[PDB]
């Protein structure tokens with residue numbers, strides 16, 4: 094059956110027919126919906142072959158050469174390579190297609206209007222932690238681009254039958270240290286406690302600030318991970334200040350410009366890429382609301398509210414909501430002042446809406462995770478709140494994977 | 499671990515398993531291929547009734563700790579006999595009270611369920627005219643409103659009968675503002691209520707022309723055309739909205755009623771279907787201040803308020819929507835507080851729902867919850883529910899949606 098999808102602000106209706114191309118089951122069953130869960134409980138030739146035929150068919154269709162000679166000779170190659178090695182390799186152009194399709198298909202991403210514009214670095218000729226680091230520095234410098242950020246992915250070597258994975262231990266290329274203190278509390282970023290402690294275990298000298306940029310633990314197959322410190326001039330950071338509130342700057346708050354995920358797995362045509370770091374630019378709510386205001390992140394709300402002299406003693410003064418708004422404004426202002434790319438949650442979701450329309454004409458649907466797509470302040474003040482969404486798994490995909498340790 | 503969904507809170511790092519979902523005897527709209535949890539409305543008796551009935555009666559006896567008893571098996575026999583010979587059956591009084599509370603308890607879209615055990619149940623199963631429905635409704639509103647100190651209540655009209663037509667309240671709520679369609683194509687009042695306004699008029703209501711005219715009730719007794727009834731203005735408590743520091747906000751003439759009372763839902767118990775059974779609580783302040791006032795397709799006042807606040811409305815990145823919504827929300831709380839009318843802010847409320855989650859975990863092993871509806875429409879991740887995973891599934895008794903009577 095094809096689901097009927099309504100926008101409640103406008104009374105408009107479409108049908109999702111794309112969802113019929115899902116070959117992978119999600120977590121819901123008719124007895125119970127599990128769609129607000131972050132993770133899956135879950136976490137041979139014939140089947141690799143079919144995902145591979147499917148994907149190649151996807152690529153030749155994409156360049157409008159379906160059923161051509163080049164298409165059939167390419168299905169033959171793949172057939173022949175699997176048949177004798179139990180695996181195959183992608184052509185650079187195909188990889189480029191798969192990476193953009195994997196972004197296109199990511200249901201938790203509100204930035205997909207950008208999906209066609211992705212700089213793809215091929216790093217499948219990497220054989221050491223050393224090389225990885227080199228590739229990673231070039232990715233950072235390219236993506237950062239003096240504040241004029243540009244989407245990029247760098248694809249390290251695929252997983253292989255015999256052997257350890259290429260991995261980046263860090264969850265992001267830039268992350269702040271979180272230091273567990275004696276009295277139970279955390280200095281710095283509570284989300285990075287464990288990865289901070291792993292870096293110390295492998296011989297990093299720690300700092301003691303709240304914004305110490307972490308080193309990278311890079312691991313080549315079956316080897317101990319290796320520590321690399323990023324050169325400080327490569328990690329663009331943005332000092333936080335407020336348009337009108339003068340003391341805010343005094344707070345010493347800052348955030349880094351580049352959001353680059355480095356622990357997710359990229360799957361294309363049955364092949365898996367355990368190290369394939371990707372980056373775009375931040376939506377300000379990610380920093381203003383979640384990273385600074387989550388109670389299990391930097392948890393700055395009370396501090397800000399007090400500074401604003403708000404009545405902290407009760408929920409009904411709405412001091413939480415008042416402070417959160419200024420912290421998001423301070424993030425937008427500061428990024429705009431330091432000429433670094435940022436998108437607010439209204440502009441972002443408005444363009445997500447455009448993307449839904451585009452996909453509806455292009456593909457007959459768009460898989461989307463409503464809980465992730467709707468922003469964390471002002472949900473119903475943005476258009477996506479009012480938009481129904483069908484969520485499902487298409488391939489190429491980005492997946493989660495276990496932590497290497 | 500156990501083969502029941504694992505459920506995680508990402509703020510505290512705590513885990514539970516929902517086993518309650520095992521008791522669900524009704525499929526929702528999702529399947530392994532695609533999740534449909536975000537649709538408001540997905541999709542659209544004989545031997546079926548009996549087993550729905552048996553199930554309910556079994557729940558009733560458990561709740562009183564008499565499962566397996568003689569009174570329990572006799573009740574079962576009594577229900578079987580009745581359906582054997584009439585196609586239907588009837589609930590004992592305390593069975594209705596249990597079921598009505600259990601239906602509120604089961605409703606995945608209600609954040610207010612810490613309150614589920616406290617519900618005044620008005621048995622109106624004797625009611626036999628639209629005039630009488632009106633008396634009952636008025637009694638409900640008086641009781642529920644209690645001069646500002648609101649009280650949860652439900653009034654249950656007679657059940658669907660096979661061969662006879664339904665009791666039906668046409669209004670979606672007991673209290674609703676009119677929406678008048680203009681010549682320029684805009685709406686004055688509440689655009690949500692454009693259809694029910696035009697039906698009131700067709701049935702001979704003489705209409706007003708304000709932004710906040712209280713609609714009359716269109717009430718339908720079995721097999722009769724519906725009849726029109728005007729609520730006496732002294733029974734509809736309203737709160738004029740002001741802001742604690744922005745002195746001009748009172749000048750906008752915004753107002754809202756005290757009593758949220760849903761009147762178009764179907765209460766199903768044991769297979770029996772109560773098509774008219776309006777229930778009411780008190781508001782969480784975001785329903786008024788954020789949805790009713792700021793939705794683009796409702797009163798849509800965000801721009802007006804931001805202009806008064808002298809915000810830059812020509813650019814998204816000034817967060818003018820965000821600042822104005824906050825203030826409108828503070829104004830809803832401030833004004834209900836001053837007027838001594840019960841209201842709860844979205845912080846207080848979501849907290850009490852986390853408590854309710856923990857109570858239900860112990861009592862029943864889980865709690866059906868609709869995340870998109872539980873999370874408030876401003877300040878989501880500032881409330882603890884945002885960080886709580888939730889399992890959604892259908893349990894009976896239940897409030898269900900039903901097709902509009904026209």
Ligand code: HEM
Nearest residue numbers: 196199201202203204207244246371372373374375376491
């Ligand atoms: C163009 C700038 C981009 C913006 C503004 C953007 C926006 C976002 C946001 C707000 C999230 C939710 C993040 C969170 O709550 O942790 C997200 C998730 C995601 N995005 Fe993007 N995105 C951008 C570019 C990209 C690119 C280049 C890729 C991949 C090539 C990508 C793939 C993903 C994926 C796979 C997720 C889900 C991550 C997860 O499950 O943790 N996005 N995006």
Ligand code: HEM
Nearest residue numbers: 602605607608609610613650651777778779780781782897
């Ligand atoms: C005591 C104070 C209560 C509060 C604060 C409250 C809160 C809420 C809220 C905020 C909603 C969502 C409203 C919307 O977005 O349309 C809701 C929905 C709902 N509540 Fe409550 N509730 C309360 C009492 C009740 C009572 C007494 C009942 C019935 C006995 C009830 C049953 C329901 C049901 C069935 C829905 C879903 C309505 C729909 O899907 O259209 N609640 N509740």
Ligand SMILES: Cc1cc(N)nc(COc2cncc(CNCCc3cccc(F)c3)c2)c1
Nearest residue numbers: 131132352353354371372373374375376379493
């Ligand atoms: C590409 C991109 C653009 C942009 N604007 N923002 C992002 C940020 O994405 C993330 C930020 N922080 C964390 C994540 C990863 N979260 C995965 C959920 C998860 C799974 C398993 C364990 C766990 F602790 C957490 C992604 C990424």
Ligand SMILES: Cc1cc(N)nc(COc2cncc(CNCCc3cccc(F)c3)c2)c1
Nearest residue numbers: 538539758759760777778779780781782899900
């Ligand atoms: C009891 C109660 C307490 C409280 N605080 N708030 C409420 C508010 O409940 C509602 C408010 N506004 C609208 C509704 C009705 N929602 C119906 C959604 C819908 C739309 C279209 C078709 C359909 F079948 C169903 C309920 C009810």
Ligand SMILES: C[C@H](O)[C@H](O)[C@H]1CNc2nc(N)[nH]c(=O)c2N1
Nearest residue numbers: 129130131464465884885886887
């Ligand atoms: C439990 C819940 O699903 C979880 O908190 C989700 C909600 N929505 C989200 N949305 C985004 N973009 N990112 C998140 O981390 C989350 N967290």
Ligand SMILES: C[C@H](O)[C@H](O)[C@H]1CNc2nc(N)[nH]c(=O)c2N1
Nearest residue numbers: 478479480481536537538870871
């Ligand atoms: C499309 C989406 O399902 C819809 O806008 C929902 C979102 N969450 C909601 N939550 C509540 N409480 N009330 C609503 O009307 C809605 N609307």
Ligand SMILES: [Zn+2]
Nearest residue numbers: 121126528533
């Ligand atoms: Zn689902």
